[PDB]
Enzyme design. Sequence first.
Site, PDB file in Angstrom:
ATOM      1  N   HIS A  49       0.704  -1.244   0.040  1.00  0.00           N
ATOM      2  CA  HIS A  49       0.001  -0.053  -0.037  1.00  0.00           C
ATOM      3  C   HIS A  49       0.763   1.275  -0.080  1.00  0.00           C
ATOM      4  O   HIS A  49       2.084   1.140   0.536  1.00  0.00           O
ATOM      5  CB  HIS A  49      -0.789   0.079   1.126  1.00  0.00           C
ATOM      6  CG  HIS A  49      -1.914  -0.946   1.240  1.00  0.00           C
ATOM      7  ND1 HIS A  49      -2.920  -1.275   0.542  1.00  0.00           N
ATOM      8  CD2 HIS A  49      -2.263  -1.804   2.504  1.00  0.00           C
ATOM      9  CE1 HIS A  49      -3.591  -2.334   0.859  1.00  0.00           C
ATOM     10  NE2 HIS A  49      -3.280  -2.567   2.108  1.00  0.00           N
ATOM     11  N   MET A  92      -9.981   2.510  -2.139  1.00  0.00           N
ATOM     12  CA  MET A  92      -8.977   2.746  -0.902  1.00  0.00           C
ATOM     13  C   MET A  92      -8.735   4.307  -0.660  1.00  0.00           C
ATOM     14  O   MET A  92      -7.441   4.576  -1.328  1.00  0.00           O
ATOM     15  CB  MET A  92      -8.097   1.621  -0.919  1.00  0.00           C
ATOM     16  CG  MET A  92      -6.900   1.828   0.399  1.00  0.00           C
ATOM     17  SD  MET A  92      -6.013   0.572   0.554  1.00  0.00           S
ATOM     18  CE  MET A  92      -5.129   0.912   1.941  1.00  0.00           C
ATOM     19  N   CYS A 117      -4.740   5.477  -1.627  1.00  0.00           N
ATOM     20  CA  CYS A 117      -3.643   4.471  -1.867  1.00  0.00           C
ATOM     21  C   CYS A 117      -3.675   4.321  -3.190  1.00  0.00           C
ATOM     22  O   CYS A 117      -4.865   3.938  -4.053  1.00  0.00           O
ATOM     23  CB  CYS A 117      -3.995   3.352  -1.191  1.00  0.00           C
ATOM     24  SG  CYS A 117      -2.824   1.851  -1.560  1.00  0.00           S
ATOM     25  N   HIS A 175      -4.878   0.936  -5.181  1.00  0.00           N
ATOM     26  CA  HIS A 175      -6.187   0.562  -4.756  1.00  0.00           C
ATOM     27  C   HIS A 175      -7.271   1.597  -4.952  1.00  0.00           C
ATOM     28  O   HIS A 175      -8.118   1.412  -4.312  1.00  0.00           O
ATOM     29  CB  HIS A 175      -6.167   0.230  -3.376  1.00  0.00           C
ATOM     30  CG  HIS A 175      -5.030  -1.103  -3.515  1.00  0.00           C
ATOM     31  ND1 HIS A 175      -4.123  -1.141  -2.414  1.00  0.00           N
ATOM     32  CD2 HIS A 175      -5.113  -2.311  -4.015  1.00  0.00           C
ATOM     33  CE1 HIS A 175      -3.469  -2.483  -2.612  1.00  0.00           C
ATOM     34  NE2 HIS A 175      -4.076  -2.986  -3.892  1.00  0.00           N
TER      35      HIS A 175
HETATM   36 CU   LIG Z   1      -3.539   0.023  -0.897  1.00  0.00          CU
END
Ligand SMILES: [Cu+2]
Length: 99
Positions: free
Chosen positions: A37, A92, A84, A87
């Site tokens: 991440h 996210m 993120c 994502h």
């Molecule tokens: Cu992520």
Amino acid sequence: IDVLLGADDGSLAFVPSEFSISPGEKIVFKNNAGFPHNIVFDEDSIPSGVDASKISMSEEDLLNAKGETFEVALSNKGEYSFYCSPHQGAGMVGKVTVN
Ligand SMILES: [Cu+2]
């Protein structure tokens, strides 16, 4: 404040994803599930004279291990949106308010 990167059920989310802090209050983003991440502040959605590089990872930077962290304290008051990078589409994202 501690923020998980990925939920305990494996969801691709920041937990919590919306929150308020005071100036200089540490945020610790901690890899939890579905890593790698990172945490990138949206440079068009933070207080307009803030330097996004002082407070975020780049889009290429990653946190690779479970329990690896990124720590930041935000100074300037107002709303900060972040996400993120890998994502973002999956949802996210979050927003922290410094008040
Ligand atoms: Cu992520």
